A paper describes a structure:
The human RNA helicase DDX1 in the DEAD-box family plays an important role in RNA processing and has been associated with HIV-1 replication and tumour progression. In DDX1, this DEAD-box core fold is disrupted by the large SPRY domain, prominently positioned in RecA-like domain 1 between the P-loop (Walker A) motif and conserved motif Ia, which separates the motifs by around 240 residues instead of the usual to 20–40 residues as in other DEAD-box proteins.
The models for the polypeptide chains A and B have a Cα r.m.s. deviation of 0.256 Å for alignment of all 193 residues (an r.m.s. deviation of 1.239 Å for all atoms), indicating that they are almost identical. hDSPRY adopts a compact β-sandwich conformation. The β-sandwich fold is slightly twisted and forms a bowl-like platform. Two layers of concave β-sheets stack together and are referred to in the following as β-sheets 1 and 2, and a third small β-sheet covers one side of the β-sandwich. β-Sheet 1 is composed of eight strands (β16, β1, β4, β13, β7, β8, β9 and β10), β-sheet 2 is composed of six strands (β2, β3, β14, β6, β11 and β12) and the small β-sheet 3 consists of only two strands (β15 and β5). We have discovered a positively charged surface region in hDSPRY that is highly conserved in DDX1 across species. This surface patch might constitute the protein–protein interaction site within hDSPRY.
Author numbering: 86 to 275
The structure:
Amino acid sequence: SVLNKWQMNPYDRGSAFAIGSDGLCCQSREVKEWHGCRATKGLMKGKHYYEVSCHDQGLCRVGWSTMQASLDLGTDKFGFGFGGTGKKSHNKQFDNYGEEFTMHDTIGCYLDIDKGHVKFSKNGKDLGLAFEIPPHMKNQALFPACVLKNAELKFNFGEEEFKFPPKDGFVALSKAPDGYIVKSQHSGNA
């Protein structure tokens, strides 16, 4: 029943990564370690959007990764991250991108599978194209993902009102058609 819902996956997370009973408010309280998670479901086609809100001053990266990726988002060729210090990450390369963000900020995460485009907004401000989906990643489902270092975030896949509704024909990830969505490979009993 856990994989049937759009939420963060208790079966696909670091040891210190904790998920609230809503499935959406997440934290990791280990001071010197990064702990990550992926959502229960992933996207294979379409233009979609989710939001994440920062609840404190801890470090975090948010974005998308495939099932082959490390939960340490952006440290391999299967993940894309945007981090609070104003850096995008992919294949262990951290580049200046966008703006810094922190407590009280909301990051919008845009994914256009059909055009192969990843981009982000901060409090409704378009930060620009962050990544193109590379040839090696084509035809592979992308799951919302984060990694935290002594931080707390809250996801919104579309089941609650968006603080900054998506532009340009992107729609809530939770409203993606059934045939364009893929269940996580990480499951169990609840």
